[PDB]
A = this chain, B = another copy of it.
Amino acid sequence: MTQSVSLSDFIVKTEDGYMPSDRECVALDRYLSKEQKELRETFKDGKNDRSALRIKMFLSPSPSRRFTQHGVVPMREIKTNTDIPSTLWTLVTDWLLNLLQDEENQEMFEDFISSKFPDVLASADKLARFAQRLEDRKDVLHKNFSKAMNAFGACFWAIKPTFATEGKCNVVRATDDSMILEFQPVPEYFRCGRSKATFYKLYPLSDEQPVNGMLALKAVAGNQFFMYHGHGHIRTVPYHELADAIKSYARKDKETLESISKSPLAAQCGSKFLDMLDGIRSKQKIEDVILKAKIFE
């Protein structure tokens, strides 16, 4: 489905200072350290909290044997096999290494990575949109380092994203409570994977259910669909791509689905979404129910 770009593909730990990572060669991976090999053996042994083991793996240093001319080879367990544009890699690595020239900043990064990160993997389109806001000089992220770090963290499913921590956007219309934003296709030389068309969103303001937000979105969306991916948003997708969304609904956990179903904001979205949720809860075949819910009245 949606390919994910790991953190180690951008930067790996070293003795004292973090170093850029080269995926050109994988032959050097044979050698390792005692703790590294012990954790590798435990990870390969059985399925026991793989994500926690991965996080523990990423926080251990590396020996000098893995050094090459360009940089440092990562491990074989925290590395993906998806290609990314050169500009994105260069910009992200340059900024991240520029920020990491401080022991206190190092401790802050470790505290954040140990605080709320559920898994290393992150969506590619999130990274592309975040780098869209970092390439241009006249923005807000340059002056406020903390807000930029919040944005980058929430880019990888860490904290609930507000308006100021989103990607690249331009508010098209507001109201008394909540707002509606419009997104645009990412330019070609940032794209990594499939392309997506225009699609709006909605962010409740503080706590209360919107009243005119539904009317405004219905006026704006026109021919579209509603959903409650994650928590705290009401995304809209075109009818076609919703097909792939059903696949993304297969991997969802039972506890997560139960938590989603127990939210008034989930009920506020509309009518057909609850029917689709009941259909996916029925554990029947996906295609037929998907087309039944996808009929155009």
Binding site for B on A (CB under 8 A): 17, 20, 24-25, 27-28, 30-31, 64, 67-71, 83, 85-86, 133, 138-140, 143, 164, 168-176, 188, 191, 195, 219, 222
A138 & B83 in contact (Cβ 8 Å cutoff): no
Q: How far is the CA of A200 from the CA of B190 in the complex (A)?
A: 32
Instruction: Give the oligomeric copy count.
Output: 6
* Pairwise interchain contact B164-A67, C-beta atoms closer than 8 A: yes
Q: Which of B25, B85, B188 contacts A188 (CB under 8 A)?
A: B85
Assembly CA distance A138 to B22 (angstroms): 11
Query: Considering the chains assembled together, what is the distance between the CA atoms of A199 and B61 in angstroms?
Result: 34
On chain B, the residues within 8 Å of A171 by CB distance are 25, 27-28, 68
- Please pick, from B20, B67, B170, B222, the residue contacting A69 in the complex, using a CB distance under 8 A: B170
Residues of B close to A219: CB separation below 8 A: 222
Taking CB atoms, residues of chain B closer than 8 Å to A25 are 170-172
> Majority SS of interface residues in chain A?
loop
Cβ of A294 to closest chain B Cβ, rounded Å:
18
Q: In the complex the two chains form, is B70's CB within 8 Å of A139's CB? A: yes
- Is there an interface contact between B27 and A69, defined as CB atoms closer than 8 Å? no
Q: Are A140 and B85 in touch, CB under 8 angstroms?
A: no
Residue of A20, A83, A133, A173 contacting most chain B CB atoms (<10 Å):
A83
B28–A140 touching, CB < 8 Å: no
Using A85-B188, A188-B86, A195-B83 as known contacts, say yes or no to A69 and B28 having CB atoms under 8 A apart: no
